[PDB]
Amino acid sequence: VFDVGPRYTNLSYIGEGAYGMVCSAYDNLNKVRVAIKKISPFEHQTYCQRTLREIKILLRFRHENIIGINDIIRAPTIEQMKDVYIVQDLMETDLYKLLKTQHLSNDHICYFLYQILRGLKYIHSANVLHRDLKPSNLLLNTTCDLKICDFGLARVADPDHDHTGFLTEYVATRWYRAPEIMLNSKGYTKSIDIWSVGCILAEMLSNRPIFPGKHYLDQLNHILGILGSPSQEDLNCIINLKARNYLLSLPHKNKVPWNRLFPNADSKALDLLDKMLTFNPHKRIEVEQALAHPYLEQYYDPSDEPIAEAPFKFDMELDDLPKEKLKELIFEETARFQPG
Ligand SMILES: Cc1cc(-c2n[nH]c3cc(NC(=O)NCc4ccccc4)ncc23)ccn1
């Protein structure tokens, strides 16, 4: 069932996830095609938490490089609400699909990276982390406008509670995971997103994922295979006994030069890549620094890189709420879109 009538008709498949599906549809009010994401999260607490976070975040945000929510469709009562549909702008493709079919020139890479970082500056200024940046979540049109989508794994930043043990399970897409995820981090600091952006830049440079780990620890094998052995100083910052012991046990690995991996890339793009793909998250470049990097000099304009008016100042505290209370919160958050 894709129950979005009567305003939205002539449905066509786009993609799907574990508990949702996105289709294109014709909007019979504005006479334009739109994207509609059906979400069916109510049987699981975790899915309810993610759905609620995405809706709350996207409804507060207003930025050219971030997908918005134009409409939310759901039943008039909690009892009758089994699914929720989110209406968004329809784009033409995503960076994942684009990279299967063509090699991007440097000036397209530069302009796309600029937009990713512009959008990320706004997200981070709101004290929010995206936590699942990857090519399929970067939507594009023929005018080369780029929008960040899929905030289902987003969280309010919590650097004071980022610590976790060695080899702790993680939810976000493997290939875009920072090394610290596998060593000592829950992915609750802004630096997690900068690593993912670095991976995306590398992927735009060669049309191949830079660290295609086949399984959980293999992801760290791929990262260390290019960055080489971490310095003593970086090891001194590693926190966990088990993470330190693991890294000290490895044979010495020298770094693979970015210009040997990417022999046709712009030298300024590789300098910025090096700074985003820095092993130690405390030394990794921040979003505002990345925007100010010489690679992006032609687009850099802090006056035209807006920040959020209303950041999320507190944790949402959804972790111990039962799925029934979360359904009530999702119902209340979506009430503004009901007729009348
Ligand atoms: C033709 C085309 C359009 C789009 C596209 N336009 N607008 C969109 C909005 C969204 N939103 C969105 O939240 N997508 C992620 C998702 C989808 C389904 C299940 C779980 C997560 N996704 C794709 C799109 C993406 C790719 N090709």
Swiss-Prot record:
Residue interval(s) of motif TXY: 168-170
The known PTMs are summarized as: Dually phosphorylated on Thr-168 and Tyr-170, which activates the enzyme. Phosphorylated upon FLT3 and KIT signaling. Ligand-activated ALK induces tyrosine phosphorylation. Dephosphorylated by PTPRJ at Tyr-170. Autophosphorylated on threonine and tyrosine residues in vitro, which correlates with a slow and low level of activation. Phosphorylation on Ser-12 by SGK1 results in its activation by enhancing its interaction with MAP2K1/MEK1 and MAP2K2/MEK2. Dephosphorylated by DUSP1 and DUSP2 at Thr-168 and Tyr-170. ISGylated.
Q: What is its EC number?
A: 2.7.11.24
Q: In which tissues is it expressed?
A: Highest levels within the nervous system, expressed in different tissues, mostly in muscle, thymus and heart.
The active site consists of 132 (proton acceptor)
What's a Pfam family this protein contains?
Pkinase
Q: Which reactions is this enzyme annotated as catalysing?
A: L-seryl-[protein] + ATP = O-phospho-L-seryl-[protein] + ADP + H(+); L-threonyl-[protein] + ATP = O-phospho-L-threonyl-[protein] + ADP + H(+)
Superkingdom of the organism of origin: Eukaryota
Cellular location(s): Cytoplasm, Cytoskeleton, Spindle; Nucleus; Cytoplasm, Cytoskeleton, Microtubule organizing center, Centrosome; Cytoplasm
Cofactor dependence is on: Mg(2+)
Record's keyword terms, sorted: Acetylation, Apoptosis, ATP-binding, Cell cycle, Cell junction, Cytoplasm, Cytoskeleton, Kinase, Membrane, Nucleotide-binding, Nucleus, Phosphoprotein, Serine/threonine-protein kinase, Transferase, Ubl conjugation
Gene3D superfamilies documented for this protein:
Phosphorylase Kinase, domain 1 (3.30.200.20), Transferase(Phosphotransferase) domain 1 (1.10.510.10)
Q: Tell me if DNA damage is a UniProt keyword of this record.
A: no
InterPro entries (alphabetical): Kinase-like_dom_sf, MAP_kinase, MAP_kinase_CS, MAPK_ERK1/2, Prot_kinase_dom, Protein_kinase_ATP_BS, Ser/Thr_kinase_AS
Activity regulation behaviour? Phosphorylated by MAP2K1/MEK1 and MAP2K2/MEK2 on Thr-168 and Tyr-170 in response to external stimuli like insulin or NGF. Both phosphorylations are required for activity. This phosphorylation causes dramatic conformational changes, which enable full activation and interaction of MAPK1/ERK2 with its substrates. Phosphorylation on Ser-12 by SGK1 results in its activation by enhancing its interaction with MAP2K1/MEK1 and MAP2K2/MEK2. Dephosphorylated and inactivated by DUSP1, DUSP3, DUSP6 and DUSP9. Inactivated by pyrimidylpyrrole inhibitors.
- Residues bound to ATP: 14-22, 37
Q: Which residues carry this modification: Phosphothreonine?
A: 168, 173
Q: Name one GO molecular function term.
A: RNA polymerase II CTD heptapeptide repeat kinase activity
- Every copy of the Protein kinase domain together lies at 8-296
Q: What is the effect of changing residue 108 to A?
A: Reduced affinity for DCC. Strongly reduced affinity for DCC
What family does the database annotate?
Answer: Belongs to the protein kinase superfamily. CMGC Ser/Thr protein kinase family. MAP kinase subfamily.
Q: How does it assemble?
A: Binds both upstream activators and downstream substrates in multimolecular complexes. Interacts with ADAM15, ARHGEF2, DAPK1 (via death domain), HSF4, IER3, IPO7, MKNK2, MORG1, NISCH, PEA15, SGK1, and isoform 1 of NEK2. Interacts (via phosphorylated form) with TPR (via C-terminal region and phosphorylated form); the interaction requires dimerization of MAPK1/ERK2 and increases following EGF stimulation. Interacts with MAP2K1. Interacts with DUSP6. Interacts with ARRB2.
Annotated PANTHER family = MITOGEN-ACTIVATED PROTEIN KINASE (PTHR24055)
Name the record gives this protein: Mitogen-activated protein kinase 1
Q: State the encoding gene.
A: Mapk1
